[PDB]
Structure formats: C-alpha cells, structure tokens
C-alpha cells in the first residue's frame, strides 16, 4: 500500500485510511505534519556489539537511499564503524556532504575491524534504517556515528 | 495500532529543530548562534494512553511501505514526503466535485 499516516487526537492514535476520510481530522498548516525517527533499542533489541553487527550485512546491486526525518529520540547506544579488508582498503563509503552523526548519544560504541566485505554497501538485515542527523539512510557510512531505528509520519492535533 | 514489540520504552526523550522563541537577540545569524550540535531543542513525551507505544509500532509498520517508496524513486535524498502527504490530504477532500449533503465532502450549511 501507500505510506501509512498516523493521526493523533488528544492522546489517542489512529491510522488514516485512504478509502475512509474523517472530516474530524483537521490540517491547518504543514507545520502539523511531523516525521519522527524512533530507535530500535526502545523495542527491546540487544544493544551489545556482536548482536548488532549480526543485524547488518553487505550487499551489491542495491543503490543507497535516504529520507529526511524531522525529529528523533535520545539514544542510549549508538555505533560508529571504521572497517577494512585484508588488503587494507576501506569497505565502507565516506559520509557524503550533508550527513552528520546522530545528534544525541549517551554511549557511542566505536567499532574497528577487518573482514570479507562481500558487498559495496552495508544494509540492515531486518529492514530498519540507520538514523543520522535528521536523515535516515539504508546504508552505513564510514566513521560517522549512527543509531538504528525506524521512521513514522504524523499529523499532530490542533495546536 | 497495537504494539507487538517484545519491550516498549514508554518514555520518549526527543530532540528536534523547530524552536519556540525566535528572539534570542542576534543568535539567529549563522555567523553567531549555535554550532552543529546546539541547534536542537529537547523535550519529554510520556506514554499517555499508550500513545508512545502506539507510535513505536506505527514506525515499525510504516517501514515496509517506506522502504518500497524509496526503491521506486531514483533521487538520493527525499524530503518531499510530508508535502506530498499534505497534497494527498487535500485531494482526498477536494479532488473533487463537492456534494454538501453527501459524504466525501466536508461542508456544513450554517
């Protein structure tokens, strides 16, 4: 289907159906629309490094893609990868202009190592996103701290 | 929406860009004002009537449709989603020939 859009009334949350339109839903300004990025650790995912690395993997034939998210959650655990292959060459791409590290991290797990980079880019096995500064990417960037999460789109109440 | 995640953090300590009070003097000038890591404002939303745990699940279910939307597009960085959602919102209501008495039309005679 199309991208689900959550609608908030008071403290209740509903999912806007395309076929059924609710006139009670009011949108007076684009400033009511808000895109939120929520971390995976909030779902009870293991934050330890070996469990995390197992959630990531390399692949080729898949271009990298990026979205913008306007607001995010403070992360207890973030990650920063700097890894190569036996020949000493980097297997992770440099963060292109505009992509910075996740703005809020308590503990940042700096990771180094070497291995068989079996792909051009490193994606998320579970389909989640690597959240950066107001940008969620499908790929890990070199040397830039990140937190892994997912994005939701909202239409806030009458403010 | 009903959270199906094994655990759910009810407390949402969040950060964002949009501010409240623009009058901090000249701090709006890029030469002055916050560095890259100071532009943010923080807040705390509580799990009122399972709102947060609802959002958490919503973010999970949205992932599929979102990931496919990105596959379709060829642009590297997509910022146009929210404006697109705003347009679809209007088209839904006014696409459109509007019958007052009938449904799919938000008008009242009073």
């Amino acid at each position, epitope marked *: 289907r199309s991208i689900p859009l959550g609608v908030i009334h008071n403290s209740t949350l509903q999912v806007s159906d395309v076929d059924k339109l609710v006139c009670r839903d009011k949108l007076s300004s684009t400033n009511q629309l808000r895109s939120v990025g929520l971390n995976l650790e909030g779902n009870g995912v293991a934050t330890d490094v070996p469990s995390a690395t197992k959630r990531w993997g390399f692949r080729s034939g898949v271009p990298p893609k990026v979205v913008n998210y306007e607001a995010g959650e403070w992360a207890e655990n973030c990650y920063n990868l700097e890894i190569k292959k036996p020949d000493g060459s980097e297997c992770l791409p440099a963060a292109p202009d505009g992509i910075r590290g996740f703005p809020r991290c308590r503990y940042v797990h700096k990771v180094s190592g070497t291995g068989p980079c079996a792909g051009d880019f490193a994606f998320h096995k579970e389909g989640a996103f690597f959240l950066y500064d107001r940008l969620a990417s499908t790929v890990i960037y070199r040397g830039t701290t990140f937190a892994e999460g997912v994005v939701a789109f909202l239409i806030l109440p009458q403010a | 929406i009903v959270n199906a995640q094994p655990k759910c953090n009810p407390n949402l300590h969040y950060w964002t860009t949009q501010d409240e009070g623009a009058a901090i003097g000249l701090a709006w000038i890029p030469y002055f004002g916050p560095a890259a890591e100071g532009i943010y404002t923080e807040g705390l939303m509580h799990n*009122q009537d399972g709102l947060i745990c609802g959002l958490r699940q919503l973010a999970n279910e949205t992932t599929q449709a979102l990931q496919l939307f990105l596959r379709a597009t060829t642009e590297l960085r997509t910022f146009s989603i929210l404006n697109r959602k705003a347009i679809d919102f209007l088209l839904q209501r006014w696409g459109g020939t509007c019958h007052i008495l009938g449904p799919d039309c938000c008008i009242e005679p009073h």
Partner: antibody
Amino acid sequence: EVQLLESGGGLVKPGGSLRLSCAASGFTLINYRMNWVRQAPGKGLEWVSSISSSSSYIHYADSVKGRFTISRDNAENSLYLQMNSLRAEDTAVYYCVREGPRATGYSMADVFDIWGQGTMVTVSS
Amino acid sequence: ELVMTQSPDSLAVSLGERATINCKSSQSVLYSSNNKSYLAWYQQKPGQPPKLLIYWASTRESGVPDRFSGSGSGTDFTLTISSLQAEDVAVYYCQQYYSAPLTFGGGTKVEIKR
C-alpha cells in the same frame, strides 16, 4: 527500586465506605494504565477496575459497577479507589496493579507486570 | 465474558521432574493482526502477591528463569516447569487480556512430591 506502597483498608460494616490508596515509586503513573484486582479468601483473582493515563477511559466489573469509583493523581504518582455500599462478597484482598505500557482504553490491553503488597478489606457486622 | 479453565487444580511432582499446567479459554484469544495470543501466566506464593511469568503466551518476562516456558495459541495453552525444584512451589494462574473484562483461571497449586 520499582514498587507500589498501599494504604487504607480494614474493617467496615455492610453498606459502609472505604478508600484504598496506592503510591508508586520507581516510575511515573502517566506512562502506564493502572488497575485494581481483588482476591477473596482462599479463592481466585477477580479484576475490579482500570483507569487510563489521561483518566479518560475508565472501566469497572459488572459486579462492582456503580458502587466503586476509581481515580488517580499522576502528579502525586498515586492511585485511589473509593468503595461505597460495601457488602460481604466484597470482602477480599485488594491489589494495586500496574498494567503494561501497551494498554490503551481504545485498543488492546496489556499484562499486569507489577503488583502491590495488597490490603485486607473485611466487611462484617 | 471469557471463562478461563485451568487443569489440574492441584499437582504434586518430584523434585527435578517436570510439571505442566493447562489453560482453556471460552473463546480464541488470538489476535489476527499480531498473530499473538493474548494470554498471561502468574505465580503466587503463599502470603505474596502474584508475579508475572509469561506474556503473549510464550514470552518470558525479564528475570524469569529459563525452566519456565509457555506455549499454545487460540483456545488451548500450557505452562511447563522443567525441573521443579523448591522455589517453584506456588499457585499458578493464567489470564487473558484479549478482551474486557480481563479474566483469570481458577489457578493451579503446584506442590512437591517427597
């Protein structure tokens, strides 16, 4: 760290009234939906009442409807239940209970992950 | 109003051997959207309030030892204790939180054979 301290209860005559109190520590009541659960002497558990964070969505057991009125104070981090027109069948141990964070008055419920120490309520002439 | 039924009412097993407790609901507690069975298990020792053991029928709560494990879906469910030991002597209740009013089973008393 996380716990619930209960007050009130005791002896009361049939038709009398009592007010159970429950004070939370280690978390904020705003995040969770609170419940009351009773347990008659030597018998099983019976759900009594529930109240959402916003205090918007409230529910009682049919056997209790109209006689009990549940309430909460998020700022004071407390939960209260006022019981009126008490009778013998209400004689039981009343537990202050926290429901999971996934519970909402307008959707599916959640489990009772934290239980209070309990308080004895005896209805007798 | 769902009626939860536990069996057996009482059970006595030798230390180190396994014990199983059944639970039967009047109606299916399976949520179509989640494919999650909304059922919970509690432990209540004498003079103490209940303690959460299992939620969503199969998922152990944090801190519950591995020997506790639940299973089943829809109508029939089971709580299983492998290697009973001493600290597991209690009354075990099953509960549905699929639809209101939330209801408990009659409870099962687990004792040790000596």
